[PDB]
């Protein structure tokens, strides 16, 4: 499965995920992006059962963007989290369930950075760090024994590199590239991905 | 004529039924709200003051909608009750979906949309209820909003609807110091306005209801003034009037 | 009449439905549109009736592409015309989808009349618009006229709009079975200039043709001047 | 109808010049038990058509009420038109096929035969809707046992007589009694000709 | 607890000629091992230049024929023009799919004359897939039939020959013999043989005998 | 005026005017008389052929509600035909849900309730046709019920609906229906109908008879042409 | 069935086999895997044959209606999303779907893949069907962005052959289509046997 | 007697109720919209809001999508509902088709909603005429006007609301290719056009300026003040 | 008076005036003659052209192989009734595989038309249909007036100026039964020609002929196809 790992900084949240989309034999695309722009200061990472994730996020995004325009003020990351989860609870028991595991992270001026862990059963949780997919058991420990309550930007990226570096060591298949984004007071920015020669 | 039903447009392009409702809103008892730097307040006049009427709710005109909102009422009783119930339902539905208090203007817009839908679809008479909204939200803080039977709301610093709304609003405009009113000063101005907004002299405490919104340690306590403090404010206004006439 | 003409559900003593005739009168308030059907093809000429130089000339739609082989001319209410034109497009696409063939102009006119027929048959008001359908099908070039009542009949050269009576009277005099597309277009432009309040130029008329083999061709700004030069 | 409870034996019919004849048993066997032994599995629809069917008699009985009212309405109009044997057959084919499409089909393998305008009609619509025209038809087992015999008589001589038809079924149901575990020795015979439709019985065998 | 589909055998073969089309089948109606009836043609006439043959579930067979005959009436009535064979190919693609998740258990091959007086054979998947063909057979012997035409009609798997055009008598002699070989090599069809020929003049039907065992 | 524009508006004096208007409409049509034999019920309706181009049997007013029930509508023919369809539907439903022929009393009651349900709503108008139901059964004798637009329906020994209802009743009361059989009663019906006929205001008519009783094994069928003429011969014998 | 399509500096090329098989039987060898939905938009085939033709047809209808209503041709990205949504509502209810919607719009030539599962991804190279893995093994080794028209063509034809050779479910004939600004053109349709002789030596 | 029902045609084929509804648009604050090569402007007049009321809730220019904005006239109650439905439609269209809603499409949907509301009784027509302008064409500016009837039109520069005739007359005689060759001159043209209708000082004109691949920029009163100062300087130069 | 607005209001005299007006609606259309011999049912209609250069309006419609109609009334209601009858015929073919009887289809048409004349919500079907068909009982020529009442007529004629055709048909009713196809068509054409004014003449461009017989399916003859029948007609005196 894909990888959704996030670190809650003192005044920022760095969330990263892969860029490999594969259909049961092979990575179909290598530049596929799996982190969605909820708003100017909130991001969405939806993995899980195919088909459902691509659209459920787009629906959550349209309704998070819709709120940002019909009101003039963007939804707070905690409100967005409650809403994204709220939708899943309604449809989970319906006849068209959304079997998607999602990760939500963003920045709120009043309160600060936040990172919420979303399970396919639509169970919300605020955690300093989290991992999604199968690899979760592989790097969740890496954060546990390595995380600090005041990870700086430079040390934050290094940790994921160690988190990503370990993944390349054990994970059976290939994840050549990963997406890395930073959410801060001035917005959401893009960082460089990673690669490793094997010749 | 062109007032048989709401859907009918006059040749000049006026919803005659909506205008009739907005004119009829004047029959309702006087209510007003002054926005203060530390909070906002509402004032209402109990038209029914019969000795045989038992006061069981104390909030005939001022209702609590959410933990951080309250809205006074003016208009038909049945329409007012339906509108307040719908307001509570909308606020709690928003809380359930988003898990944060409605930013006031959202509730105002929802109620205005309901009223507009009523004034558009045929077979429904316009809600002849104009109700003032107060509350605090993380986005803009203290706000006072006016809702008309036509669904046209609007931010306001101090307004009065019902009997003699024009005089109360005009003399609030005359003596409202923008950005320099405290809750005590707001209550003093509200009592001063209510004294002459109603024909009844001496502004009996039992005949006036005042509710205040305050921001205490992040709780947004809505307090309905007890008769004791209302009487104290009335006595203070009487002494102030005596002092003013001292110049005579 | 004042008591029997307040609904398509009421019958006048004559038996006339005094609401469809009002729809026809409404179609009488639109810009003139002319269509001539000749062996070489079908031509549609109309009046722009531009109201302000600021408005985009292409914004107002008088001749539209219902399908690649059938063109429609509008004369009357804009809303009814747009709804009927969209329904005609959808019907043509549905026929192509289900039957893998281009629906005949007669079939498309029937489909549009069906919607023009539900003027109160319990699944509103009559569609106050008359559409001139012109195109080429397996039977050759054709032109079909529709009125708000839903009655459609094949017409060789029909004029609809504000100047329907005079345009039709002159068309009767200037139409013969052996006309070619060039002469038909010249005659249509001459008639429109005859029944046009403003002097004819390239900014107040849009001319459309649909010939066999080729598709619906709407004369562009440069093309229209070439034809107006001689007329 | 998802689990038949009361079923029926085979239904046999062979067409001859001048009409058609059908016969059926009178043993309603719930499971392996002879639940009822005085039921009629062949009743007439009109003066020039008759039908009989196997399977759930309750399901068939429902068909009896439908056809009766459906048939009775035919003469109420009094226009002269009456459902031709093909007419009933066509209704039957769509009747069961429509029912099967909703997973509630009539577990009742019908046979309809009649005499109309000088031609005989012998159709069979199975419990699911299959239907065809044959000079001789047998439902259920009769297809296994009596049906093969009828081809031999028809193959060499496609023309038969009423007596030849009468015993032919008797030699058909007789072999049904010997080699069947659900048959019964009491059956009716339905004869349809210009004179009309007549039902008589029962009949035994040695 | 209930199988709504029962196999009813039959083989349909359509050959597309230059100026004629051929449709034929076996009138042996049988389910499982029994023989329902030996006169049940799978050739169905729809229009002067369009003949449809349906093999497989016979119950779905007659309904698909009734619907197509009905849809033919509606199209003829609405547009005042009998639909061409090409249109029928599209319709069956749609009608078949309309009952997708309860598939129309019928394999239909259409044989008719196109606008230019040329043959037209369409092969239908019971779920909607369709495609024009010059020759094709289906049902049960579809496996045993297709290869032979490729050798003879398609010149498939052979070398140093002139791909001569197919003629009426030569094609019919081909279809007659090919079906006969199907009866001998395959026991799932027989007891009769109904061949329908559709040409410019119209359609013709002939029948022949087969085995009894 | 004012209270008579809808069927749901009670008149100030307490009368639903639209029902009376429907009764007048049925009164504006031709006569139809049902006479109960000692062993059957006989229906006879004067069917005026509005034009010579008709097919001698067109728009017949004698309708077979069921096998044993005969209906003799008179009035607005469209409403009569609709009522016949509803009566057939009710008979079919009764037979299906109960298994035996719907008794004439129960069928008449249900059809009368259906008719009355159309004089209670503003969106519908009362039926403009009055009909009489007739049937015979050994179990329950011969019954003849007449239901008018108002919805009232009680049994009759003999009734006439149409223009000359009073004239028909004058010469029907002079007939002993208690004992006579359904053989001479047909001739009596033909004569009585022929008596009640303007013949100067109505150009011509095509007498059509019907009966249901013991002589017809309990089923209702058109009177045979062989004996229908005999009734016509008797009517002609009667000078009027 | 297996189809291949890819983009490059010169355009987008789509080629596919023509072998339809029902289990062990070779159903037919003339089926056109590439469906000509629109003059300037091409669609591929995979899985169910009936599923593709109808649902590509439905997208073909919407594109035609969209072109007339908006007077501007639908963006190739627009169609990709439409099919993904247009096919979801039947997801998991018994539907098989696979195809790449290829076209050249105002946003540059784009390629998208839509499947019954509900996946829609972009990219420059694609191959769907049984021979997808076999088809891939060739086109990755021979994919360069600047392949010229003639040399690019051989890659598609060769790619399918190595797929149909290594695959026992694809075969018959190979069709090649080229999509440009003017639309798509039927490049070539060479049978496997002819391709055997050319590639044999 | 033919002006009391929407679905009743007058003897001369007039749907009188829609014409009466347009009168509602005739009673609103003027809106002026002119589109330039790289800019689309939506002029508006403020109504000098009461001394003791907040103007934040009197927004008359609202953006349906991230790059499409509309300025309306007529009754605010219906305009708000139309705006909300337009926003929901834009977010649904994006959902079904990833391509952002075009200005043409949003105008078409607004017209369709208005027509559906003016097609049968028991549904009063929307008494707001919306000027929808946006660069949604991906490199092409477009401006549209949705009449209360339901018909839309493409306008290089059009006026709605009170004084629409005068503003349209001014725009026709002053909108030339030389006029809108630059964004600043386009804004100056908008200000000049709105000046003849609204004779008043600052804060009486709200200008919504949108540039290519950008977001709405509701010009602050100072910037409008700067542009009015520039226009006064130009008038002084002319004299 | 004031009882002239709805079909659910009863006049004091006992008439539903709206039904009378719907019946009057027939006379606004072109005259149509329908007649039947022993084996054929031929109906001739006159076609009116809105303009000199516009195709003449279709008047004889196709319902099924054995059921033809002539529409003399509202085009809307005429087309709706034609579509409903087409659906009924197709349903009868699908479910019964037998030609739906003309009498039963006419009864269904009457039943469907009765409802609009009894319940507010839609106007009566203002189209007069001349249904011609062949079934087991021979040719049938019905007329279904908007009053929901249909009459089985040997040779009916509705529409404007239809009285002359009706009078001629009444005069020559006897010969209709024992006449061939040609004589039946010629008598129908004479009946139509009687309706026309003195100046107008039965031209090939304004006459539509429909025939259903023992072994002949319904046929609609327009333009030249009517020429074989038209030629030989006696010149009007």
């Amino acid at each position: 499965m894909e990888y959704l790992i996030g670190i809650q900084g003192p005044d920022y949240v760095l969330v990263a995920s892969d860029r490999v989309a594969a259909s049961n034999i092979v990575q179909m695309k290598d530049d596929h992006d799996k982190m969605f722009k909820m708003s100017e200061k909130i991001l969405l990472l939806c993995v899980g059962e195919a088909g459902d994730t691509v659209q459920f996020a787009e629906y959550i995004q349209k309704n998070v963007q819709l709120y940002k325009m019909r009101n003039g003020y963007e939804l707070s990351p905690t409100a967005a989290a409650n809403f994204t989860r709220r939708n899943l609870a309604d449809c989970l028991r319906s006849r068209t369930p959304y079997h998607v595991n999602l990760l939500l992270a963003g920045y709120d001026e009043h309160e600060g950075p936040a990172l919420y862990y979303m399970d396919y059963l639509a169970a919300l949780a605020k955690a300093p760090f989290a991992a999604h997919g199968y690899g979760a058991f592989l790097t969740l420990s890496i954060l546990d024994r390595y995380y600090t309550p005041t990870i700086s930007r430079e040390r934050a990226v290094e940790l994921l590199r160690k988190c990503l570096e370990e993944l390349q060591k054990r994970f059976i298949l290939n994840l050549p590239t990963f997406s890395v984004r930073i959410i801060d007071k001035n917005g959401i920015h893009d960082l460089d991905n990673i690669s490793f020669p094997k010749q | 004529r062109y007032d048989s039903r709401t859907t009918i447009f006059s040749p000049e392009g006026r919803l005659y039924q909506v205008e009739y409702a907005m004119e009829a809103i004047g029959h309702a008892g006087t209510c007003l709200g002054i926005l203060a730097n530390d909070g906002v307040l509402l004032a209402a006049e109990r038209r029914n003051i019969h000795k045989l009427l038992d006061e069981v709710f104390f909030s005939e005109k001022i209702y609590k909608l959410n933990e951080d909102m309250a809205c006074s009422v003016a208009g038909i009783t049945s329409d007012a009750n339906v509108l307040t119930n719908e307001l509570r339902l909308i606020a709690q539905r928003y809380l359930l979906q988003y898990q944060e208090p409605i930013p006031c203007e959202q509730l105002v817009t929802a109620l205005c949309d309901i009223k507009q839908a009523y004034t558009q679809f045929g077979g429904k008479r316009p809600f002849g209820v104009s109700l003032l909204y107060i509350g605090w939200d993380k986005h803009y803080g203290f706000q006072l909003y006016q809702s008309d039977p036509s669904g046209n709301y609007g931010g306001w610093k101090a307004t009065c609807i019902g009997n003699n709304s024009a005089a109360a609003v005009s003399m609030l405009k005359q003596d409202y110091k923008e950005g320099e009113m405290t809750l005590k000063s707001a209550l003093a101005l509200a009592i001063k306005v209510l004294n002459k907004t109603m024909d009844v002299s001496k502004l009996s405490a039992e005949k006036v209801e005042i509710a205040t919104l305050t921001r205490e340690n992040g709780k947004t306590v809505i307090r309905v003034l007890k008769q004791k403090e209302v009487e104290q404010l009335i006595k203070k206004h009487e002494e102030e009037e005596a002092k003013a006439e001292r110049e005579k | 009449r004042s008591e029997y003409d307040r609904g398509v559900n009421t019958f006048s003593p004559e038996g006339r439905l005094f609401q469809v005739e009002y729809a026809i009168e409404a179609i009488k308030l639109g810009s003139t549109a002319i269509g001539i059907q000749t062996s070489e093809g079908v031509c549609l000429a109309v009046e722009k009736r531009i109201t302000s130089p600021l408005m985009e000339p292409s914004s107002i739609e008088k001749i539209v592409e219902i399908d690649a082989h059938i063109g429609c001319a509008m004369s009357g209410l804009i809303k009814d015309a747009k709804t009927l034109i969209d329904k005609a497009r959808v019907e043509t696409q549905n026929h192509w989808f289900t039957y893998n063939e281009t629906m005949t102009v007669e079939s498309v006119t029937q489909a549009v009349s069906n919607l023009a027929l539900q003027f109160g048959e319990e699944d509103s008001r009559p569609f106050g618009v008359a559409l001139l359908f012109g195109g080429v099908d397996e039977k050759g070039p054709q032109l079909f006229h529709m009125d708000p009542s839903g009655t459609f009949v094949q017409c060789d050269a029909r004029a609809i709009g504000s100047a329907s009576e005079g345009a039709q009277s002159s068309l009767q005099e200037v139409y013969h079975k052996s006309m070619t597309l060039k002469e038909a277009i010249k005659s249509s432009l001459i008639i429109l200039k005859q029944v046009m309040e403003e002097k004819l130029n390239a900014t107040n008329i849009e001319l459309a043709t649909v010939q066999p083999g080729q598709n619906f061709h709407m004369f562009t700004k440069e093309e229209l001047e070439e034809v107006i030069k001689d007329i | 109808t998802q689990n038949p409870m009361v079923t029926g034996t085979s239904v046999l019919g062979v067409k001859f010049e001048g009409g058609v004849v059908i016969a059926a048993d009178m043993l309603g066997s719930y499971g392996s038990l002879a639940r009822f032994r005085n039921i009629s599995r062949i009743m007439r629809v009109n003066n020039s058509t008759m039908l009989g069917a196997s399977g759930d008699y309750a399901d068939f009985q429902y068909l009896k009420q439908v056809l009766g009212q459906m048939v009775i309405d035919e003469e109420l109009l009094g226009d002269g038109h009456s459902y031709s044997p093909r007419a009933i057959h066509s209704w039957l084919t769509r009747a069961m096929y429509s029912r099967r499409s909703k997973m509630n089909p009539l577990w009742n393998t019908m046979v309809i035969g009649g005499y109309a305008d000088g031609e005989s009609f012998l159709g069979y619509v199975d419990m699911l809707g299959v239907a065809y025209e044959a000079p001789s038809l047998a439902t259920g087992y009769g297809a296994y046992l009596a049906q093969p015999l009828l081809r031999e008589v028809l193959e060499k001589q496609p023309v038969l007589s009423q007596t030849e038809a009468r015993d032919l079924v008797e030699r058909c149901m007789r072999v049904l009694y010997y080699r069947d575990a659900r048959s019964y020795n009491r059956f009716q015979i339905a004869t349809v000709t210009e004179k009309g439709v007549e039902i008589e019985g029962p009949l035994s065998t040695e | 607890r209930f199988s709504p589909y029962v196999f009813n055998g039959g083989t349909i073969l359509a050959i597309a000629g230059e100026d004629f089309a051929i449709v034929a089948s076996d009138t042996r109606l049988s389910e499982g091992f029994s023989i329902h009836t030996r006169d049940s043609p799978k050739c169905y006439k729809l229009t002067d230049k369009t003949v449809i043959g349906c093999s497989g579930f016979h119950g779905d067979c007659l309904t698909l024929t009734k619907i197509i005959e009905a849809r033919l009436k509606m199209y003829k009535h609405s547009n005042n023009k009998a639909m061409t064979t090409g249109a029928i190919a599209a319709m069956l693609s749609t009608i078949l799919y309309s009952r997708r998740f309860f598939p129309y258990y019928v394999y239909n091959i259409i044989g008719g004359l196109d606008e230019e007086g040329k043959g037209a054979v369409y092969s239908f998947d019971p779920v909607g897939s369709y495609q024009r063909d010059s020759f094709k057979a289906g049902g049960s012997a579809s496996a045993m039939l297709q290869p032979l035409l490729d050798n003879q009609v398609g010149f498939k798997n052979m070398q140093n020959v002139e791909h001569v055009p197919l003629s009426l008598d030569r094609a019919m002699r081909l279809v007659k013999d090919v079906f006969i070989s199907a009866a001998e090599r395959d026991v799932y069809t027989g007891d009769a043989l109904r061949i329908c020929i559709v040409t410019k003049e119209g359609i013709r039907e002939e029948t022949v005998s087969l085995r009894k065992d | 005026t004012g209270y008579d524009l809808s069927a749901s508006t009670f008149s100030p004096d307490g009368r639903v005017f639209q029902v009376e208007y429907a009764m007048k409409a049925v009164e504006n049509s031709s006569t139809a008389i049902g006479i109960r034999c000692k062993d059957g019920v006989v229906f006879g309706v004067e069917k005026l052929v509005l034009s010579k181009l008709y097919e001698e049997g067109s728009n017949k007013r004698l309708f077979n509600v069921d096998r044993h029930v005969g209906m003799a509508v008179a009035g607005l023919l469209a409403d009569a035909r609709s009522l016949a369809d509803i009566a057939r539907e009710e008979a079919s439903n009764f037979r299906s849900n109960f298994g035996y022929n719907i008794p004439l009393k129960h069928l008449a009651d249900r059809v009368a309730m259906y008719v009355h349900a159309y004089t209670l709503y503003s969106a519908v108008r009362p039926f403009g046709c009055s009909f009489m139901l007739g049937s015979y059964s050994v179990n329950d004798g011969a019954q003849l019920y007449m239901i008018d637009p108002s919805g009232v329906s009680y049994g009759y020994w003999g009734c006439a609906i149409g223009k000359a209802r009073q004239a028909a009743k004058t010469e029907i009361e002079k007939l002993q229906m208690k004992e006579m059989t359904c053989r001479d009663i047909v001739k009596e019906v033909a004569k009585i109908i022929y008596i009640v006929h303007d013949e100067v205001k109505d150009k011509a008519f095509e007498l059509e008879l019907s009966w249901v009783g013991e002589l017809t094994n309990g089923r209702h069928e058109i009177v045979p042409k062989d004996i229908r003429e005999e009734a016509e011969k008797y009517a002609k014998e009667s000078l009027k | 069935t297996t189809t291949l399509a890819f983009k490059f500096r010169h355009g987008v090329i789509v080629a596919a086999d023509s072998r339809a098989t029902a289990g062990a039987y070779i159903a037919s060898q003339t089926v056109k895997k590439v469906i000509e939905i629109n003059p300037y938009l091409l669609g591929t085939m995979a899985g169910g044959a009936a599923d593709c033709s109808f649902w590509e047809r439905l997208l073909a209808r919407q594109c035609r209606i969209y072109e007339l209503r908006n007077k501007e041709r639908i963006s190739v990205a627009a169609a990709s999303k439409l099919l993904a949504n247009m096919v979801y509502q039947y997801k998991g209810m018994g539907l098989s779907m696979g195809t790449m919607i290829c076209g050249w719009d105002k946003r540059g030539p784009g390629l998208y893949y839509v499947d019954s599962e509900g996946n829609r991804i972009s990219g420059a190279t694609f191959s769907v069907g049984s021979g997808s893995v076999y088809a891939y093994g060739v086109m990755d080794r021979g994919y360069s962005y600047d392949l010229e028209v003639e040399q690019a063509y051989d890659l598609a034809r060769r790619a399918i052959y190595q797929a149909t050779y290594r695959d026992a479910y694809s075969g018959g004939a190979v069709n090649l289509y080229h999509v440009r600004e003017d639309g798509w053109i039927r490049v070539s349709s060479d049978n496997v046997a002819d391709l055997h002789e050319k590639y044999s030596g | 007697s033919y002006d009391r029902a929407i679905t009743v045609f007058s003897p001369d084929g007039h749907l009188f109720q829609v014409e009466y509804a347009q009168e509602a648009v005739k009673k609103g604050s003027t809106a002026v919209g002119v589109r330039g090569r790289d800019i689309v402007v939506l002029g508006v007049e403020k109504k000098s809001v009461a001394k003791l009321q907040d103007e934040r809730t009197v927004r008359k220019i609202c953006a349906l999508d991230d790059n499409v904005c509309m300025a309306f006239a007529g009754l605010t109650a219906d305009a708000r509902i139309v705006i909300n439905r337009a926003r929901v439609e834009c977010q649904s269209h994006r959902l079904t088709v990833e391509d952002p809603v075009t200005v043409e499409y949003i105008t078409r949907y607004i017209a369709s909603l208005k027509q559906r509301y003016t097609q049968s009784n028991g549904r009063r027509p929307f008494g707001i005429s919306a000027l929808i302008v946006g660069f949604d064409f991906d490199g092409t500016p477009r401006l549209y006007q949705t009449d209360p009837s339901g018909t839309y039109h493409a306008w290089k520069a059009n006026a709605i609301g009170r004084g629409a005739k005068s503003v349209r007359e001014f725009l026709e005689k002053n909108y030339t290719d030389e006029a809108i060759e630059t964004d600043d001159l386009t804004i100056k043209l908008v200000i000049k056009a709105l000046l003849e209708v609204v004779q008043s000082g600052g804060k009486n004109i709200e200008l919504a300026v949108m540039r290519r691949d950008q977001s709405l920029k509701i010009l602050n009163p100072e910037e409008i003040e700067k542009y009015v100062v520039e226009i006064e300087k130009e008038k002084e130069e002319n004299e | 008076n004031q009882y002239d607005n709805d079909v659910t209001v009863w006049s004091p005299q006992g008439r539903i005036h709206q039904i009378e007006y719907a019946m009057e609606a027939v006379k606004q259309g072109s005259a149509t003659v329908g007649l039947k011999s022993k084996t054929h049912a031929v109906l001739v209609a006159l076609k009116r052209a809105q303009s000199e250069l516009a195709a003449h309006q279709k008047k004889i419609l196709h319902v099924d192989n054995h059921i033809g109609i002539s529409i003399a009334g509202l085009t809307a209601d005429a087309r709706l009734l034609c579509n409903f009858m087409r659906q009924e015929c197709l349903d009868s073919r699908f479910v019964f595989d037998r030609p739906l009887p003309v009498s039963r289809l006419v009864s269904l048409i009457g039943s469907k038309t009765q409802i609009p004349t009894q319940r507010y919500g839609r106007r009566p079907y203002g189209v007069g249909l001349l249904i011609a068909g062949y079934d087991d009982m021979g040719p049938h020529i019905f007329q279904t007036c908007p009053s929901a009442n249909y009459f089985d007529c040997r040779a009916m004629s509705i529409g404007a100026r239809s009285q002359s055709a009706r009078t001629y048909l009444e005069r020559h009713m006897s010969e209709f039964m024992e006449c061939n196809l040609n004589e039946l068509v010629k008598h129908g054409l004479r009946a139509l020609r009687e309706t026309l004014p003195a100046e107008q003449d039965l031209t090939t461009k304004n006459v539509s002929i429909g025939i259903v017989g023992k072994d002949l399916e319904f046929t609609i003859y327009d333009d030249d196809d009517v020429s074989p029948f038209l030629e030989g007609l006696e010149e009007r005196p």
Side-chain angles (χ1 to χ4, degrees), chain B residues 64 66-69 135-137 142 213-218 220-223:
Chain B
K64 204 172 181 93
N66 232 36
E67 273 51 18
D68 66 353
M69 217 145 194
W136 155 91
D137 43 37
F142 304 108
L213 180 77
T214 48
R215 272 304 281 159
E216 294 213 322
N217 82 341
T220 279
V221 58
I222 279 310
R223 249 277 300 286

Side-chain angles (χ1 to χ4, degrees), chain D residues 5 18 37 46 60 81 92-93 104 107 145 147 150 153 158 167 184 190-191 195:
Chain D
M5 290 338 172
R37 318 88 54 91
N46 34 298
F60 175 83
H81 284 131
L92 254 188
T93 39
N104 177 269
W107 222 294
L145 165 153
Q147 218 42 43
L150 308 190
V153 46
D167 47 2
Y184 187 89
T191 190
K195 55 75 157 173

Side-chain angles (χ1 to χ4, degrees), chain G residues 17 39 44 51 61 67 87 90 97 99 111 118 137 152 160 167 173 196:
Chain G
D17 86 85
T44 80
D51 281 325
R61 165 140 89 66
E67 197 250 329
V87 61
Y90 297 118
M97 207 52 223
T99 180
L111 170 48
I160 185 43
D167 186 316
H196 208 164

Side-chain angles (χ1 to χ4, degrees), chain C residues 96-113:
Chain C
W96 171 96
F97 172 99
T98 309
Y99 295 52
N100 219 32
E101 56 147 17
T102 66
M103 207 184 356
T104 305
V105 279
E106 188 271 349
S107 305
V108 68
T109 283
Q110 273 219 304
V112 78
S113 92

Side-chain angles (χ1 to χ4, degrees), chain F residues 4-5 18 21 24 52-56 79 81 118 123 125-127, chain I residues 3 9-12 16 36 114 118-119 149-152 154-155 170:
Chain F
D4 81 29
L5 264 63
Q18 277 286 91
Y21 284 63
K24 214 172 301 163
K52 302 228 285 296
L53 277 289
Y54 287 173
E55 263 309 13
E56 298 73 43
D79 281 19
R81 184 161 330 180
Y118 266 16
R125 57 162 194 72
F127 282 110
Chain I
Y3 314 116
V9 85
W10 270 101
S11 169
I16 328 184
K36 55 142 171 163
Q114 191 276 347
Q118 177 123 7
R119 171 179 299 88
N149 213 9
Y150 56 68
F151 317 132
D152 158 3
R154 308 186 164 112
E170 183 275 340

